[PDB]
Amino acid sequence: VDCSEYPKPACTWEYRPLCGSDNKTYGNKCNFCNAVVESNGTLTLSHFGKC
């Protein structure tokens, strides 16, 4: 997963979870990448799938 094209003003809402370094499951890549941006690059990917 690469969050360079982010942030994006909108995300589709399909569910394909990712597990962030904050132990939160992010519903999809768009959701995850926007949070990475919002965290000013501090959030990272822990693993694919639910946390």
Partner: protein, 185 residues
């Protein structure tokens, strides 16, 4: 199974929009971004209960897809959860609407604008969208937006979340019904 229930493809999970039909052929509508590249649909995570196969997909530009039921026994309720749906209608600004999705359940709000353009990036732009102040989250895609017994749209995407509030865009269901020559029941 009815509008708002979970549906699983080989890729992930979305929500069933509305059960529709043409003659004696049953299908269900959902988001085009969910039907894109998906073939078979199942009713459960275990992929043991088959629903049917994708018959059409339109995304980006629009955001709707249709799946033909191949499961002959599963009940196909013309409702959204327990809510009966008896017709389809056009959204209007100020209209009170309700959405149901497989992740967040049922949430209400109002239509705030029409004919909105949503850019999901990478060339994925959808046009003619209904904008609302209703929240939605991953897994809710394709779920129904209704108003009383009237079918209004299919969940496409947006921003925010249900805890802090959000903005969700929906594809007008009338457009999908017309493209496929199907009707709600």
């Amino acid at each position: 199974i009815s509008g708002g229930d979970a549906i699983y493809s080989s890729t992930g999970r979305c929500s069933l929009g509305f059960n529709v039909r043409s003659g004696s052929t049953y299908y269900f509508l959902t988001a085009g971004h969910c039907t894109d590249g998906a073939t078979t649909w199942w009713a459960n995570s275990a992929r043991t209960t088959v629903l049917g196969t994708t018959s059409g997909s339109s995304f980006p530009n629009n955001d709707y897809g249709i799946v033909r039921y191949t499961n002959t026994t599963i009940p196909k309720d013309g409702t959204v959860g327990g809510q009966d749906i008896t017709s389809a209608a056009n959204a209007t600004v100020g209209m009170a609407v309700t959405r149901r999705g497989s992740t967040t359940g049922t949430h209400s709000g109002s239509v705030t604008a029409l004919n909105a353009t949503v850019n999901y990036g990478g060339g994925d732009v959808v046009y003619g969208m209904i904008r609302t102040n209703v929240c939605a989250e991953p897994g809710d895609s394709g779920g129904p937006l209704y108003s009383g017994t009237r079918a209004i749209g299919l969940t496409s995407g947006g921003s925010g979340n249900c805890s802090s509030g959000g903005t969700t865009f929906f594809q007008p269901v009338t457009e999908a019904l017309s493209a496929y020559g199907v009707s709600v029941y």
